[PDB]
Coordinates of C-alpha atoms and ligand atoms in Angstrom, one line a residue:
Chain H
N1 CA -7.5 -41.8 -12.5
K2 CA -8.8 -44.9 -10.6
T3 CA -7.5 -48.4 -10.9
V4 CA -9.6 -50.4 -13.2
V5 CA -11.1 -53.7 -11.9
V6 CA -10.7 -56.5 -14.5
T7 CA -13.0 -59.6 -14.3
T8 CA -11.6 -62.6 -16.0
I9 CA -11.7 -66.3 -15.7
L10 CA -9.4 -69.2 -14.9
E11 CA -9.3 -70.9 -18.3
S12 CA -6.4 -72.4 -20.1
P13 CA -4.4 -70.8 -21.9
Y14 CA -6.3 -67.4 -21.4
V15 CA -5.6 -67.0 -17.6
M16 CA -3.6 -69.5 -15.5
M17 CA -1.9 -69.4 -12.3
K18 CA 1.9 -69.3 -12.7
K19 CA 3.8 -72.3 -11.4
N20 CA 5.3 -70.2 -8.5
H21 CA 2.1 -68.2 -7.8
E22 CA 2.0 -68.5 -4.1
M23 CA 5.1 -66.4 -3.9
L24 CA 3.6 -63.6 -6.3
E25 CA 1.4 -60.8 -5.6
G26 CA -1.5 -59.0 -7.6
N27 CA -1.5 -59.3 -11.5
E28 CA 1.9 -61.1 -11.3
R29 CA 0.4 -64.4 -10.1
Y30 CA -1.3 -64.9 -13.6
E31 CA -0.1 -65.7 -17.1
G32 CA -1.8 -66.4 -20.3
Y33 CA -3.1 -64.9 -23.4
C34 CA -5.6 -62.6 -21.8
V35 CA -3.0 -61.6 -19.2
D36 CA -0.9 -60.3 -22.0
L37 CA -3.9 -58.8 -23.9
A38 CA -5.0 -56.9 -20.7
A39 CA -1.4 -55.6 -20.2
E40 CA -1.6 -54.4 -24.0
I41 CA -5.1 -53.0 -23.7
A42 CA -4.1 -50.9 -20.5
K43 CA -0.9 -49.6 -22.1
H44 CA -2.6 -48.4 -25.2
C45 CA -5.6 -46.8 -23.2
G46 CA -3.6 -45.6 -20.5
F47 CA -4.9 -47.3 -17.4
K48 CA -3.7 -49.1 -14.2
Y49 CA -5.6 -52.3 -13.4
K50 CA -6.1 -55.2 -11.1
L51 CA -7.0 -58.6 -12.4
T52 CA -9.7 -60.5 -10.5
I53 CA -11.1 -63.8 -11.1
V54 CA -14.8 -64.0 -11.4
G55 CA -16.5 -65.2 -8.0
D56 CA -18.6 -67.6 -9.3
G57 CA -16.2 -69.0 -11.9
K58 CA -18.9 -68.6 -14.7
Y59 CA -19.1 -66.8 -18.1
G60 CA -22.6 -65.5 -17.8
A61 CA -26.1 -66.3 -18.2
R62 CA -29.4 -65.0 -17.0
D63 CA -31.8 -66.8 -14.7
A64 CA -34.9 -67.3 -16.4
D65 CA -37.0 -66.8 -13.4
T66 CA -35.1 -64.2 -11.4
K67 CA -33.7 -62.5 -14.4
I68 CA -30.3 -62.1 -12.6
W69 CA -27.0 -62.4 -14.5
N70 CA -24.2 -64.4 -13.2
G71 CA -20.7 -64.7 -14.1
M72 CA -18.5 -62.0 -15.7
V73 CA -21.5 -60.5 -17.3
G74 CA -23.2 -60.0 -13.9
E75 CA -20.1 -58.5 -12.5
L76 CA -20.2 -55.8 -15.2
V77 CA -24.1 -55.6 -15.1
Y78 CA -24.1 -55.0 -11.2
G79 CA -21.1 -52.8 -10.9
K80 CA -18.7 -55.2 -9.5
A81 CA -15.9 -54.9 -12.2
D82 CA -15.0 -52.3 -14.7
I83 CA -14.2 -54.6 -17.9
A84 CA -14.0 -58.0 -18.7
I85 CA -11.0 -59.4 -20.5
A86 CA -11.6 -63.1 -21.2
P87 CA -12.7 -65.5 -23.8
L88 CA -16.3 -64.1 -23.6
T89 CA -18.4 -64.9 -26.5
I90 CA -20.0 -62.0 -28.2
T91 CA -24.0 -62.8 -28.2
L92 CA -27.1 -60.9 -28.9
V93 CA -28.4 -61.7 -25.4
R94 CA -25.3 -60.1 -23.9
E95 CA -25.0 -57.2 -26.2
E96 CA -28.4 -56.1 -24.8
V97 CA -26.9 -55.7 -21.4
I98 CA -23.2 -54.9 -21.8
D99 CA -21.0 -53.4 -24.3
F100 CA -18.5 -55.6 -26.6
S101 CA -15.5 -54.5 -28.4
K102 CA -15.0 -55.8 -32.0
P103 CA -13.7 -59.4 -31.7
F104 CA -10.2 -60.1 -30.9
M105 CA -10.5 -63.9 -31.7
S106 CA -12.5 -66.0 -34.0
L107 CA -14.1 -69.3 -32.8
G108 CA -16.8 -71.8 -33.5
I109 CA -18.4 -74.5 -31.5
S110 CA -16.8 -77.9 -32.1
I111 CA -16.6 -81.5 -31.0
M112 CA -14.0 -83.0 -28.5
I113 CA -13.5 -86.7 -28.6
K114 CA -11.1 -89.2 -26.8
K115 CA -8.9 -90.6 -29.8
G116 CA -10.5 -93.5 -31.7
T117 CA -14.2 -92.6 -30.7
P118 CA -16.2 -93.3 -33.8
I119 CA -17.7 -90.0 -34.2
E120 CA -16.9 -87.6 -37.1
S121 CA -19.7 -85.0 -37.0
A122 CA -22.6 -83.5 -35.0
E123 CA -24.8 -85.5 -37.2
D124 CA -22.9 -88.5 -36.0
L125 CA -23.5 -87.7 -32.3
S126 CA -27.2 -87.1 -33.0
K127 CA -28.0 -90.5 -34.6
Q128 CA -26.6 -92.6 -31.7
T129 CA -26.9 -93.2 -28.0
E130 CA -24.0 -95.2 -26.9
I131 CA -21.8 -92.0 -26.7
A132 CA -23.1 -89.4 -24.4
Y133 CA -22.3 -85.6 -25.0
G134 CA -22.6 -82.3 -23.3
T135 CA -21.5 -78.7 -22.9
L136 CA -20.5 -76.2 -20.3
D137 CA -23.2 -74.5 -18.0
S138 CA -23.8 -70.9 -17.9
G139 CA -22.1 -70.0 -21.5
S140 CA -22.9 -69.4 -25.0
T141 CA -22.4 -72.9 -26.3
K142 CA -25.4 -74.1 -24.0
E143 CA -27.5 -71.3 -25.2
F144 CA -26.7 -72.2 -28.8
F145 CA -28.2 -75.5 -28.5
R146 CA -31.2 -74.4 -26.4
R147 CA -32.0 -72.0 -29.1
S148 CA -31.1 -73.9 -32.3
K149 CA -33.7 -74.7 -34.9
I150 CA -31.3 -76.5 -37.0
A151 CA -32.5 -80.2 -37.0
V152 CA -29.5 -81.9 -36.0
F153 CA -28.7 -79.3 -33.2
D154 CA -32.5 -79.3 -31.9
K155 CA -32.4 -83.1 -31.7
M156 CA -29.0 -82.9 -29.8
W157 CA -30.5 -80.3 -27.4
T158 CA -33.6 -82.4 -26.9
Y159 CA -31.1 -85.4 -25.8
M160 CA -28.9 -83.0 -23.7
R161 CA -31.4 -81.2 -21.6
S162 CA -33.1 -84.7 -20.4
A163 CA -30.0 -86.9 -20.3
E164 CA -29.5 -88.7 -17.1
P165 CA -26.8 -88.5 -15.4
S166 CA -26.5 -84.8 -16.4
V167 CA -24.2 -84.3 -19.3
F168 CA -23.3 -80.5 -18.6
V169 CA -20.1 -79.5 -16.6
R170 CA -19.5 -76.7 -14.3
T171 CA -16.1 -75.9 -16.1
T172 CA -14.3 -76.8 -19.4
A173 CA -11.7 -78.6 -17.4
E174 CA -14.3 -80.7 -16.0
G175 CA -15.7 -81.5 -19.5
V176 CA -12.2 -82.4 -20.7
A177 CA -11.5 -84.7 -17.8
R178 CA -14.6 -86.5 -18.5
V179 CA -13.7 -87.0 -22.0
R180 CA -10.4 -88.3 -21.0
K181 CA -11.7 -90.7 -18.4
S182 CA -14.9 -92.2 -20.2
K183 CA -13.0 -94.4 -22.7
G184 CA -14.8 -92.9 -25.7
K185 CA -18.2 -92.9 -24.2
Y186 CA -18.3 -89.0 -23.6
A187 CA -17.8 -86.3 -26.3
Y188 CA -17.7 -82.7 -25.3
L189 CA -19.1 -79.7 -27.4
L190 CA -16.8 -76.7 -26.6
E191 CA -15.3 -73.8 -28.5
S192 CA -12.7 -74.6 -31.2
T193 CA -10.1 -72.3 -29.4
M194 CA -10.2 -74.3 -26.2
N195 CA -10.5 -77.6 -28.2
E196 CA -7.4 -76.9 -30.4
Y197 CA -5.4 -76.0 -27.2
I198 CA -6.2 -79.2 -25.6
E199 CA -5.3 -81.2 -28.6
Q200 CA -1.6 -80.0 -28.3
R201 CA -1.4 -80.7 -24.6
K202 CA -0.2 -84.0 -22.9
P203 CA -1.4 -86.5 -22.6
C204 CA -2.2 -86.0 -26.2
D205 CA -5.4 -88.3 -26.1
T206 CA -8.2 -85.9 -27.3
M207 CA -9.1 -84.4 -30.7
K208 CA -11.1 -82.1 -32.4
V209 CA -13.4 -83.7 -35.0
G210 CA -15.4 -82.3 -37.9
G211 CA -15.9 -78.6 -38.8
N212 CA -17.1 -75.8 -36.4
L213 CA -20.9 -75.7 -35.8
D214 CA -20.9 -71.6 -35.9
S215 CA -18.6 -68.9 -36.5
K216 CA -18.4 -66.2 -33.8
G217 CA -15.9 -64.2 -31.7
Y218 CA -14.8 -63.1 -28.3
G219 CA -14.8 -59.5 -27.2
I220 CA -13.7 -57.4 -24.4
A221 CA -16.8 -56.4 -22.6
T222 CA -17.7 -53.1 -20.5
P223 CA -20.8 -51.9 -18.6
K224 CA -23.4 -50.3 -21.1
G225 CA -22.2 -46.9 -21.6
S226 CA -18.8 -47.1 -19.8
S227 CA -16.1 -44.4 -20.3
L228 CA -13.7 -47.0 -21.4
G229 CA -15.5 -48.8 -24.3
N230 CA -14.5 -46.4 -27.1
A231 CA -10.7 -46.6 -26.3
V232 CA -10.8 -50.3 -25.7
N233 CA -12.5 -50.9 -29.1
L234 CA -9.8 -48.9 -30.9
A235 CA -7.1 -50.6 -28.9
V236 CA -8.4 -54.1 -30.2
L237 CA -8.3 -53.0 -33.8
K238 CA -4.8 -51.5 -33.4
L239 CA -3.4 -54.7 -31.7
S240 CA -5.1 -56.8 -34.5
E241 CA -3.5 -54.6 -37.2
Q242 CA -0.1 -54.6 -35.7
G243 CA -0.1 -58.5 -35.8
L244 CA 0.0 -58.7 -31.9
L245 CA -3.2 -60.8 -31.5
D246 CA -1.6 -63.3 -34.1
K247 CA 1.7 -63.0 -31.9
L248 CA -0.3 -64.0 -28.7
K249 CA -2.2 -66.9 -30.4
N250 CA 1.1 -68.3 -31.5
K251 CA 2.8 -67.9 -28.2
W252 CA 0.0 -69.5 -26.0
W253 CA -1.3 -72.4 -28.6
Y254 CA 1.5 -73.6 -30.6
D255 CA 4.9 -72.5 -29.4
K256 CA 3.9 -73.9 -25.9
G257 CA 2.4 -77.2 -27.7
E258 CA 3.7 -80.5 -26.3
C259 CA 2.4 -83.1 -28.7
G260 CA 5.1 -82.4 -31.2
Chain G
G1 CA -39.6 -37.0 -37.9
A2 CA -41.5 -39.4 -40.3
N3 CA -39.6 -42.4 -41.6
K4 CA -37.4 -41.6 -44.5
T5 CA -36.0 -44.2 -47.0
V6 CA -32.6 -45.3 -45.9
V7 CA -30.0 -44.6 -48.7
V8 CA -27.6 -47.6 -48.7
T9 CA -24.3 -47.4 -50.5
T10 CA -22.8 -50.6 -51.9
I11 CA -20.2 -51.9 -54.6
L12 CA -20.7 -53.9 -57.7
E13 CA -18.4 -56.8 -56.5
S14 CA -19.2 -60.3 -57.1
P15 CA -21.0 -62.3 -55.4
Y16 CA -22.0 -59.5 -53.1
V17 CA -23.8 -57.4 -55.3
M18 CA -24.4 -58.2 -59.1
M19 CA -26.7 -56.9 -62.0
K20 CA -29.4 -59.2 -62.6
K21 CA -29.4 -60.5 -66.3
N22 CA -32.6 -58.9 -66.9
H23 CA -31.8 -55.6 -64.7
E24 CA -32.9 -53.1 -67.7
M25 CA -36.7 -54.3 -67.3
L26 CA -36.7 -54.3 -63.5
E27 CA -36.8 -51.1 -61.0
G28 CA -35.0 -50.0 -57.9
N29 CA -33.7 -52.6 -55.7
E30 CA -34.9 -55.5 -57.9
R31 CA -32.2 -54.7 -60.5
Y32 CA -29.4 -56.3 -58.1
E33 CA -28.9 -59.5 -56.8
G34 CA -26.3 -61.1 -54.5
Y35 CA -25.2 -61.8 -50.9
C36 CA -25.2 -58.1 -49.8
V37 CA -28.6 -57.7 -51.6
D38 CA -29.9 -60.6 -49.5
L39 CA -28.3 -59.1 -46.4
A40 CA -29.5 -55.6 -46.9
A41 CA -33.2 -56.9 -47.2
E42 CA -32.9 -58.7 -44.0
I43 CA -31.2 -55.8 -42.0
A44 CA -33.8 -53.6 -43.3
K45 CA -36.7 -56.2 -42.2
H46 CA -35.5 -56.6 -38.8
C47 CA -34.7 -52.8 -38.2
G48 CA -38.0 -51.8 -39.6
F49 CA -36.9 -49.5 -42.5
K50 CA -37.7 -48.9 -46.2
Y51 CA -34.3 -48.6 -48.2
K52 CA -32.7 -47.8 -51.6
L53 CA -29.7 -49.5 -52.8
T54 CA -27.4 -47.2 -54.6
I55 CA -23.9 -48.2 -56.2
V56 CA -21.0 -46.0 -54.9
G57 CA -20.2 -43.3 -57.8
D58 CA -16.5 -43.8 -57.9
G59 CA -16.4 -47.7 -57.6
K60 CA -14.2 -47.5 -54.5
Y61 CA -14.2 -49.0 -51.1
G62 CA -12.8 -45.9 -49.1
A63 CA -9.4 -44.4 -48.4
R64 CA -8.3 -41.0 -47.3
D65 CA -6.1 -39.0 -49.8
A66 CA -2.8 -38.3 -48.0
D67 CA -2.8 -34.5 -49.6
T68 CA -6.5 -33.5 -49.5
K69 CA -7.6 -35.6 -46.4
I70 CA -10.9 -36.3 -48.4
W71 CA -12.4 -39.8 -48.1
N72 CA -13.3 -41.5 -51.3
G73 CA -15.4 -44.5 -51.9
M74 CA -18.3 -45.9 -49.7
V75 CA -16.6 -44.5 -46.7
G76 CA -16.6 -41.0 -48.2
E77 CA -20.4 -41.5 -49.0
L78 CA -21.0 -42.1 -45.4
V79 CA -18.6 -39.2 -44.0
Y80 CA -20.0 -36.5 -46.3
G81 CA -23.8 -37.4 -45.9
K82 CA -24.5 -38.9 -49.1
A83 CA -25.6 -42.5 -47.7
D84 CA -27.1 -43.5 -44.5
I85 CA -25.5 -46.9 -44.3
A86 CA -23.0 -49.1 -46.3
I87 CA -23.9 -52.8 -46.8
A88 CA -21.0 -54.2 -48.7
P89 CA -17.9 -56.3 -48.3
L90 CA -16.2 -53.4 -46.2
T91 CA -13.5 -54.2 -44.0
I92 CA -13.5 -53.0 -40.4
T93 CA -10.2 -50.9 -40.0
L94 CA -8.9 -48.7 -37.2
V95 CA -8.5 -45.7 -39.6
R96 CA -12.2 -46.1 -40.8
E97 CA -13.6 -46.7 -37.2
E98 CA -12.3 -43.3 -36.3
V99 CA -14.5 -41.6 -39.0
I100 CA -17.5 -44.0 -39.4
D101 CA -19.3 -46.8 -37.1
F102 CA -19.1 -50.4 -37.9
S103 CA -21.4 -53.3 -36.5
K104 CA -19.9 -56.5 -35.3
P105 CA -18.7 -58.4 -38.3
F106 CA -20.9 -60.5 -40.5
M107 CA -18.2 -62.4 -42.5
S108 CA -14.6 -63.5 -41.4
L109 CA -11.8 -62.9 -44.0
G110 CA -8.0 -62.5 -44.4
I111 CA -5.6 -61.3 -47.1
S112 CA -4.8 -64.3 -49.4
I113 CA -2.8 -65.1 -52.5
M114 CA -4.5 -65.9 -55.8
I115 CA -2.5 -67.7 -58.4
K116 CA -3.0 -69.3 -61.8
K117 CA -3.0 -72.9 -61.3
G118 CA 0.4 -74.2 -61.4
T119 CA 2.4 -71.2 -60.6
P120 CA 5.3 -72.1 -58.3
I121 CA 4.3 -70.2 -55.2
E122 CA 3.0 -71.6 -51.8
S123 CA 3.2 -68.6 -49.7
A124 CA 3.8 -64.9 -49.1
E125 CA 7.4 -65.8 -48.1
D126 CA 7.7 -67.5 -51.7
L127 CA 6.4 -64.2 -53.5
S128 CA 8.9 -62.1 -51.5
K129 CA 11.9 -64.2 -52.1
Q130 CA 11.6 -64.1 -55.8
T131 CA 11.1 -61.6 -58.9
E132 CA 10.0 -63.6 -61.9
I133 CA 6.2 -63.4 -60.7
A134 CA 4.8 -59.9 -60.2
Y135 CA 2.1 -59.4 -57.6
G136 CA -0.1 -56.7 -56.6
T137 CA -3.2 -55.5 -54.7
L138 CA -6.7 -53.4 -55.3
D139 CA -5.3 -49.9 -55.6
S140 CA -7.5 -48.5 -53.2
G141 CA -8.6 -50.6 -50.1
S142 CA -7.7 -52.2 -46.9
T143 CA -5.4 -54.7 -48.5
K144 CA -3.0 -52.0 -49.9
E145 CA -3.0 -50.3 -46.6
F146 CA -2.1 -53.4 -44.8
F147 CA 1.0 -53.7 -46.8
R148 CA 1.7 -49.9 -46.6
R149 CA 1.7 -50.1 -42.7
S150 CA 3.0 -53.6 -42.2
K151 CA 6.2 -53.9 -39.9
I152 CA 6.6 -57.7 -40.4
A153 CA 9.6 -58.3 -42.5
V154 CA 7.9 -60.5 -45.2
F155 CA 5.2 -57.9 -45.8
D156 CA 7.5 -55.0 -45.7
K157 CA 9.6 -56.6 -48.3
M158 CA 6.5 -57.1 -50.5
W159 CA 5.4 -53.5 -50.0
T160 CA 8.9 -52.4 -51.0
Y161 CA 8.5 -54.2 -54.2
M162 CA 4.9 -53.4 -54.8
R163 CA 5.1 -49.8 -54.4
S164 CA 7.9 -49.2 -56.9
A165 CA 7.2 -51.9 -59.4
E166 CA 6.7 -50.6 -63.0
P167 CA 4.4 -51.0 -64.8
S168 CA 1.9 -50.6 -61.9
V169 CA 1.0 -54.0 -60.0
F170 CA -2.2 -52.3 -58.6
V171 CA -5.7 -52.9 -60.1
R172 CA -8.8 -50.6 -60.0
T173 CA -11.2 -53.4 -59.3
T174 CA -11.0 -57.3 -58.2
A175 CA -12.3 -58.1 -61.7
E176 CA -9.2 -56.3 -63.2
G177 CA -6.9 -58.2 -60.8
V178 CA -8.5 -61.7 -61.5
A179 CA -8.4 -61.1 -65.3
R180 CA -4.6 -60.3 -64.8
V181 CA -4.0 -63.4 -63.0
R182 CA -5.7 -65.4 -65.8
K183 CA -4.1 -63.8 -68.8
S184 CA -0.5 -63.7 -67.3
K185 CA 0.5 -67.3 -68.0
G186 CA 1.6 -67.7 -64.0
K187 CA 3.6 -64.5 -64.1
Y188 CA 1.3 -62.4 -61.8
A189 CA -0.2 -63.5 -58.6
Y190 CA -3.1 -61.4 -56.9
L191 CA -3.3 -60.3 -53.1
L192 CA -7.0 -60.1 -52.1
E193 CA -9.4 -61.1 -49.5
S194 CA -10.1 -64.9 -48.9
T195 CA -13.7 -64.4 -49.6
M196 CA -13.2 -63.1 -53.0
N197 CA -10.5 -65.6 -53.6
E198 CA -12.7 -68.7 -52.7
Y199 CA -15.5 -67.3 -54.7
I200 CA -13.5 -67.1 -57.9
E201 CA -11.9 -70.7 -57.0
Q202 CA -15.6 -71.9 -57.8
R203 CA -16.0 -70.0 -60.9
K204 CA -15.4 -71.1 -64.7
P205 CA -12.9 -71.6 -66.1
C206 CA -11.6 -72.9 -63.0
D207 CA -8.1 -72.0 -63.6
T208 CA -7.1 -70.0 -60.3
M209 CA -6.6 -71.1 -56.8
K210 CA -6.0 -69.7 -53.3
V211 CA -2.7 -70.7 -51.8
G212 CA -1.1 -70.7 -48.3
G213 CA -2.7 -69.4 -45.1
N214 CA -4.3 -66.1 -44.7
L215 CA -2.0 -63.2 -44.0
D216 CA -4.3 -61.6 -41.5
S217 CA -7.6 -62.0 -39.7
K218 CA -10.5 -59.7 -39.7
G219 CA -14.1 -59.1 -40.7
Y220 CA -16.6 -57.0 -42.8
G221 CA -19.0 -54.8 -41.0
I222 CA -22.2 -52.6 -41.9
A223 CA -21.0 -49.2 -41.8
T224 CA -23.2 -46.1 -40.6
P225 CA -22.1 -42.3 -40.1
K226 CA -20.6 -41.8 -36.7
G227 CA -23.3 -41.6 -34.0
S228 CA -26.1 -42.5 -36.4
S229 CA -29.6 -43.6 -34.9
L230 CA -29.4 -46.8 -37.1
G231 CA -26.2 -48.3 -35.5
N232 CA -27.4 -49.9 -32.6
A233 CA -30.6 -51.8 -34.2
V234 CA -28.2 -52.6 -37.3
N235 CA -25.5 -54.4 -34.8
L236 CA -28.3 -56.2 -33.1
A237 CA -29.8 -57.6 -36.2
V238 CA -26.3 -58.8 -37.3
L239 CA -25.9 -60.6 -34.1
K240 CA -29.6 -62.2 -34.5
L241 CA -29.0 -63.2 -38.1
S242 CA -25.4 -64.6 -37.2
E243 CA -26.9 -66.6 -34.3
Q244 CA -30.0 -68.0 -36.5
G245 CA -27.5 -69.2 -39.1
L246 CA -28.5 -66.9 -41.7
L247 CA -25.2 -65.6 -42.5
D248 CA -23.8 -69.1 -42.9
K249 CA -26.8 -69.8 -45.3
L250 CA -26.2 -66.8 -47.4
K251 CA -22.4 -67.7 -47.8
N252 CA -23.4 -71.2 -48.9
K253 CA -25.8 -69.7 -51.4
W254 CA -23.6 -67.4 -53.2
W255 CA -20.2 -69.2 -52.9
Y256 CA -20.8 -73.0 -53.0
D257 CA -24.3 -73.8 -53.8
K258 CA -24.0 -72.2 -57.4
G259 CA -20.2 -73.0 -57.8
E260 CA -19.1 -74.1 -61.3
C261 CA -16.2 -76.2 -60.6
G262 CA -17.9 -79.2 -59.0
Ligands
JAC1 O1 -9.3 -63.0 -35.4 C1 -9.8 -62.0 -35.4 C2 -9.1 -60.7 -34.6 C3 -9.8 -59.5 -35.5 C4 -11.0 -59.9 -36.0 N1 -10.8 -61.5 -36.1 C5 -11.3 -62.3 -37.3 C6 -12.9 -62.4 -37.0 C7 -13.7 -61.9 -38.0 C8 -15.0 -62.2 -37.6 C9 -15.5 -62.5 -36.4 N2 -16.9 -62.5 -36.1 N3 -17.5 -62.1 -34.8 C10 -18.7 -62.3 -35.2 C11 -19.6 -62.0 -33.8 F1 -19.7 -60.6 -33.7 F2 -19.2 -62.6 -32.6 F3 -20.9 -62.3 -34.1 C12 -19.1 -63.0 -36.1 C13 -17.8 -63.0 -36.9 C14 -17.8 -63.7 -38.2 C15 -19.3 -64.3 -38.6 O2 -20.3 -63.2 -38.2 C16 -20.3 -63.4 -36.8 C17 -14.6 -63.0 -35.5 C18 -13.3 -62.8 -35.8
LIG2 N1 -17.0 -68.6 -24.3 C1 -18.2 -69.0 -23.6 C2 -17.8 -70.1 -22.6 C3 -17.4 -71.4 -23.2 C4 -18.5 -72.2 -23.9 O1 -19.8 -71.8 -23.6 O2 -18.3 -73.1 -24.7 C5 -19.0 -67.8 -23.2 O3 -18.5 -66.7 -23.2 O4 -20.0 -68.0 -22.6
LIG3 N1 -12.8 -55.1 -48.4 C1 -11.7 -54.1 -48.7 C2 -11.5 -54.1 -50.4 C3 -10.8 -55.3 -51.0 C4 -9.4 -55.3 -50.7 O1 -8.7 -54.3 -50.4 O2 -8.7 -56.3 -51.0 C5 -12.0 -52.7 -48.3 O3 -13.1 -52.7 -47.4 O4 -11.3 -51.8 -48.5
ZN4 ZN1 1.1 -52.6 -28.2
ZN5 ZN1 -33.2 -69.7 -10.7
ZN6 ZN1 -35.1 -62.3 -41.1

């Protein structure tokens, strides 16, 4: 029995520092949906664990030239963590190098605007130039646009990849701040889960517009062939069927909502 | 050894698999059409196998008998070696995952309520608090098991009612449940997956609707026998087809493009 090293990422409301974190130690420093989920998964699988925050603050992408993975995916691939418990999107390129559990949450790519921005859809963004728009770096949303051969999305990528100044951001928090401070001239493409959370937080000045652009899931990731993968997968299904995943979503999204 | 034709188990459930109007003068896989027929062709293409569609003999999804411990339905066909793969609206569940493998999901769904239009019901809570309107589920499937196992008060109350209701509120097929809603003048509501509910909502005579939120959140997966050689490739194919947009295209094709209610 060794202590399982969990890689995760500071991303609200999945993993956040507690208000009084500087007087706390180890796993107790953190709170959120994924902190609660990690505790449940560990209990059902019978392991002790240490939450670590991913060194480079990234989800994970492969460098096209060196072929080296960064982010949480890299931490699994290179043996620096035993499991990733985070809002980590299940994707084909990742499933080729790590294992994922069945999904614990559904999501799709979505559009965040400052309230009153005259945009209702992806189509709307693609047909104009007044309002800039971008995505997170080193994540699945950027890759979605990079690979899409859907007319509207391909046009969006052509604009985004060459836009000056850069429309990409290092963290979700940076993307949201950019929307909030840009007086309606920046829209942000991000996962519906994070969009819907921010929509219910003060100062209540953003909103999700239009339908989701795709439909996918987050999964708990382990290194290819790991001894933990089987148990973790069954634990996710058990938590789903018990209603625990629904309980946690309600706890962290809507019970804590502050826009009424 | 040499490549063998893959036996695919599936179920006659609209719009996933249906008999073509002219099926008697067609052969083999060409007899059938639907979302799962289109998906099977794509999975087969991408994984590089030839296949034969077969309809599950007992017309069931899959449950384990309490007494005999024998699995029926498509799950049983995989467990007992009669089929190599199931391509169907088969729900990923823990009890099934213990005996077969599932791909990552190809379609999201949740348990939902179907009413005859005008029935004074807006929620599961509403059903649970009243007695004039009967309600039930497919008699062997993941929806029945959901209610059987739920520790949530509203759903426990519903199960306590359904399990003891006479005459039986359970049905043998989705089609039977839908017909029961339609003929019962608002006095029967049917608990079924959102996917099937939304499909029927777009079918003549346009007299049913889905009401309230979904009761749970889950998915359908492509299933293979435990440790099958096909599992890895099938899973990658699902993710590829998801990412390209094929799954969205197929849902629109079979649900909404051919909808009969505007
Ligand atoms: O809320 C929850 C918790 C338990 C599962 N659940 C609902 C759910 C259902 C399906 C998905 N997923 N997950 C994926 C994928 F694996 F990421 F590709 C795909 C879908 C649907 C479309 O096909 C791709 C994701 C979530
Ligand atoms: N969940 C994403 C990060 C957020 C995004 O790309 O929008 C990932 O796993 O890469
Ligand atoms: N998809 C379900 C059948 C339909 C239902 O139970 O509502 C299953 O796999 O058992
Ligand atoms: Zn638990
Ligand atoms: Zn580089
Ligand atoms: Zn194809």
